[PDB]
């Protein structure tokens, strides 16, 4: 998170920290969120050989009683996820066991929206991603308020599709989601509207978020069969 502020410890109980193991390299990380006691929603580009989830965390270097590190048994990437276009950047992770509900761990209902969130609306996103282009991932959970933009604002991302994605981040400001924040939910009015997906390597806003509403049926499908 760039230009954000550290969250009050455990104020975002649904936030998941993911450690991803790849085959030919060191581990990677992303965010994500608990939607069911045994299901975490995240970005497809965060897939790997195996993933371990940490719930109840604030400062990920110091373990505390709130921590619940859960094994992921299956990764359900969207069947249409395209690496080149980054379309359908959404993935579901089935946990080995159901998480315990505590003051630090809880689910975020994949909602019920009467109408789509209009541009101009200020939403917020949290993550442990880099806080700068050459800066490392944050130790603590950071949170920033971003403005939902008109799709024209993201035209420069040649594969950006208004129907599948959200354009977030006022280009006149520096605040933005960045590397490592992928999979984190974008909440507007207290409801998750998108998932951090991609942006510019130089961190200039806006960034592109996966529009959740569009995948609601696929998500349900997977939940119902597992």
């Amino acid at each position: 998170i760039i230009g954000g502020t550290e969250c009050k410890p455990h104020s975002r109980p649904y936030m998941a920290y993911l450690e991803i193991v790849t085959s030919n390299g060191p581990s990677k990380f992303c965010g994500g969120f608990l939607i069911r006691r045994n299901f975490v929603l995240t970005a497809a580009h965060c897939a790997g050989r195996s993933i371990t989830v940490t719930l109840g965390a604030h400062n990920i270097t110091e373990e505390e009683d709130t921590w619940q590190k859960l094994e992921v048994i299956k990764q359900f990437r969207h069947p249409k996820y395209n690496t080149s276009t980054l379309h359908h950047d959404i993935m579901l992770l089935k946990l080995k066991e159901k998480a315990s509900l505590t003051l630090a761990v809880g689910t975020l209902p994949f909602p019920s929206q009467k109408n789509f969130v209009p541009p101009g609306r200020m939403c917020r996103v949290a993550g442990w991603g880099r806080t700068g282009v050459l800066k490392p991932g944050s130790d603590t959970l950071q949170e920033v308020k971003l403005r939902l933009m008109d799709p024209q604002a993201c035209s420069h991302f040649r594969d950006f599709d208004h129907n599948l994605q959200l354009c977030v981040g006022n280009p006149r400001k520096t605040k933005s989601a960045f590397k490592g924040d992928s999979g984190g939910p974008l909440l507007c009015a207290g409801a998750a509207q998108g998932i951090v997906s991609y942006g510019r390597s130089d961190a200039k806003p806006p960034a592109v978020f996966t529009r959740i509403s569009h995948y609601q049926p696929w998500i349900n499908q997977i939940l119902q069969a597992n």
């Binding site: 970005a43 580009h45 594969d159 960045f178 590397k179 490592g180």
Partner: peptide, 4 residues
């Protein structure tokens, strides 16, 4: 475009 860089995946986050």
């Amino acid at each position: 475009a860089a995946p986050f």
